[PDB]
């Protein structure tokens, strides 16, 4: 395709050199919003389709959290071609997050740090938005292009549990699936929620709040966990998610660790690393959280997709749906499109009938 070079080669990269990323990051979900976007001529073939999480999804691929973090881009979003959005993370209050500079680009690694600290319009704005949308994201949904909200937590919270219970209470309702985020690094005893007896009691007070909302508006309720998890963790996690009936994970978040190789001048920036380098660690994470459910709880894959072979790598791990976000600050929108027809070029190479036949393939051989 003549945009990915031309989005590649020339416009990402004088993006890049005009803004700090932050700034281009405003300008890229603004132009989003008002669906100023290249044409996204690929048509999704039936085979990209996938039915999971009590959804159709036109295809496997979504916008990782983050991008829209106030779900002010959803609709621009679907037409760059996600299969599905995914917005947040979402804080009960509203709050500004870390000082500035909190996002930087390590162009040389395709990588990017970010430590913004969970800056959120809060639950209350977020609602209004979503509510003014809300039948035709109906709508979206009964076509195959669900919508999830990943639920963080305030900076000054007492209750970490409180505050996701107040998430689901809000935007349960608006949501085809919830994330409770437990892995953001950016956030002070955030990740500790993830060991055992902590995140047995905040699922179980989640769930509980989950299934105290109307038929309708009863979403699957999904854990995002970090690729940096001990062998001890990820056990503890898969048996926590089998006692509770937790509907899926999102694996993974950002890393803390860096990768040995790592040539970016701001590669010792605090933050949580995301792009190129996190890719296999991510892969291997969703490899052994499948392994260890059994393959019966469905996983998003996450962390360094940026081709039809990064995502078809996920799928076979485990994954029954990938999502991506730091790819496009380098190859911009066409990588959408470019993931999609790479990814049902290999499935048809390799004698897959379709996304779904090579879910967890790797597992099977
Ligand atoms: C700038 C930035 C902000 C992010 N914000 C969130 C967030 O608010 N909540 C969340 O669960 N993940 C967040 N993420 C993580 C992504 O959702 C994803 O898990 C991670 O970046 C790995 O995917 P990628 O390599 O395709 O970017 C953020 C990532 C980046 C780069
Ligand atoms: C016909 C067009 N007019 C404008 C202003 C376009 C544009 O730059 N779109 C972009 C560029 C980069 C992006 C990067 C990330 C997300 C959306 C993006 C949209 S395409
Ligand atoms: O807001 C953040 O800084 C943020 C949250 C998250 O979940 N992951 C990330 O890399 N950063």
Do not use: C, N, Q, Y
């Given at each position: 395709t003549g945009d990915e070079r031309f989005y590649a080669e020339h416009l990402m990269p004088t993006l890049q050199g005009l803004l700090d990323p932050e700034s281009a990051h405003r300008l890229?979900?603004?132009?989003?919003?008002?669906?100023?976007?290249?044409?996204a001529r690929f048509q999704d073939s039936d085979m990209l389709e996938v039915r999971?999480?009590?959804?159709?999804?036109?295809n496997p691929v979504g916008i990782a959290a983050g991008f829209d973090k106030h779900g002010e881009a959803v609709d621009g979003l679907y037409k760059?071609?996600?299969?599905?959005?995914?917005?947040?993370?979402?804080?009960?209050?509203?709050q500004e997050g870390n000082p500035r500079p909190r996002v930087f680009?390590?162009?040389?690694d395709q990588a990017v740090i970010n430590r913004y600290g969970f800056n959120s319009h809060g639950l209350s704005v977020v609602e209004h938005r979503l509510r003014a949308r809300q039948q035709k994201q109906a709508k979206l949904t009964e076509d195959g292009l669900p919508l999830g909200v990943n639920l963080g937590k305030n900076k000054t919270s007492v209750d970490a549990?409180?505050?996701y219970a107040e998430g689901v209470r809000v935007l349960g309702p608006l949501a085809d699936y919830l994330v409770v985020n437990v892995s953001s690094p950016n956030t002070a005893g955030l990740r500790s929620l993830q060991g055992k007896a902590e995140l047995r009691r905040l699922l179980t007070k989640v769930l509980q709040?989950?299934?105290?909302?109307?038929?309708?508006?009863?979403?699957?309720?999904?854990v995002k966990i970090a690729p940096?998890?001990?062998?001890q963790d990820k056990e503890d996690i898969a048996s926590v998610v089998k006692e509770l009936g937790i509907d899926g994970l999102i694996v993974t978040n950002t890393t803390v660790s860096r990768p040995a190789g790592l040539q970016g001048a701001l590669r010792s920036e605090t933050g949580g690393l995301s792009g190129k380098p996190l890719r296999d660690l991510s892969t291997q994470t969703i490899r052994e959280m499948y392994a260890l459910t059994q393959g019966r709880v469905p996983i998003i894959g996450v962390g360094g997709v940026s081709s039809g072979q990064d995502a078809l790598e996920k799928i076979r791990a485990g994954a029954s749906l990938v999502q991506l976000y730091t790819a496009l600050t380098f190859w911009g929108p066409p990588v959408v499109g470019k993931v999609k027809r790479e990814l049902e070029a290999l499935l048809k190479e390799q004698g897959f009938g379709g996304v779904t036949d090579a879910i967890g393939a790797d597992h099977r051989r």
């Open positions: 890229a979900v603004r132009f989003t919003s008002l669906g100023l976007l290249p044409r999971v999480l009590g959804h159709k999804f036109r760059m071609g996600f299969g599905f959005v995914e917005i947040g993370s979402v804080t009960p209050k509203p680009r390590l162009p040389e549990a409180e505050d709040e989950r299934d105290g909302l109307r038929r309708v508006h009863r979403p699957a309720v999904l940096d998890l001990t062998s």
